[PDB]
Design a protein around this ligand. Structure first.
Ligand SMILES: Cc1[nH]c(=O)nc(-c2ccccc2)c1[N+](=O)[O-]
Length: 164
């Protein structure tokens, strides 16, 4: 069912993560990590101290879908094992901030066609699929969007709850 999920999402904060390629989301799903540019890193560290759960919702551009969502389990840190992100043209790994540890809650995809009824008050009430990398999603919109995903029966939320 969906009860433990609703418990994890209670009073959470939600951020949209836009990636240019599937490889970076695959690395994030395998390694339980994400790294963002410093502008977003500062927002996510502030958010992590501010709320009981901070949720990242991932979408690969041109895919027409979200690829899943995850919960920050740490503030960002530096000096860990290198991660071979696939960067946009002209970019270098040094442009990134630190690395956040994340616990995946759903590794399943959700097509944008299923979230067309959801708009984000923090982005001019544009459909929730629309937003820059790092756009915050308001609480109610973010909760309903997460509840739309197919349940990921491979994940035990008992473990996630046991870090809140
Ligand atoms: C994974 C990730 N996350 C992020 O917030 N930003 C980027 C990016 C964008 C331009 C230059 C360097 C990085 C990457 N990336 O590996 O392409």
């Amino acid at each position: 069912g969906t009860s433990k999920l609703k418990y994890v999402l209670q009073d959470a904060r939600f951020f949209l993560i836009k990636s240019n390629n599937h490889e970076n989301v695959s690395l994030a799903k395998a390694k339980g990590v994400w790294s963002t540019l410093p502008v977003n890193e500062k927002k996510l560290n502030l958010a992590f101290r501010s709320a009981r759960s901070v949720i990242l919702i991932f979408s690969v551009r041109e895919s027409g879908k979200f690829q899943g969502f995850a919960r920050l389990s740490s503030e960002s840190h530096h000096g860990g094992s290198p991660i071979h992100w696939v960067l946009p043209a002209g970019m270098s790994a040094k442009m990134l901030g630190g690395v956040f540890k994340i616990d995946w809650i759903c590794r399943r995809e959700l097509p944008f066609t299923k979230s067309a009824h959801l708009t984000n008050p923090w982005n001019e009430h544009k459909p929730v699929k629309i937003g820059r990398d790092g756009q915050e999603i308001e609480l109610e919109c973010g909760t309903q969007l997460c509840l739309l995903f197919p349940p990921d029966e491979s994940i035990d939320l008992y473990q996630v709850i046991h870090k809140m």
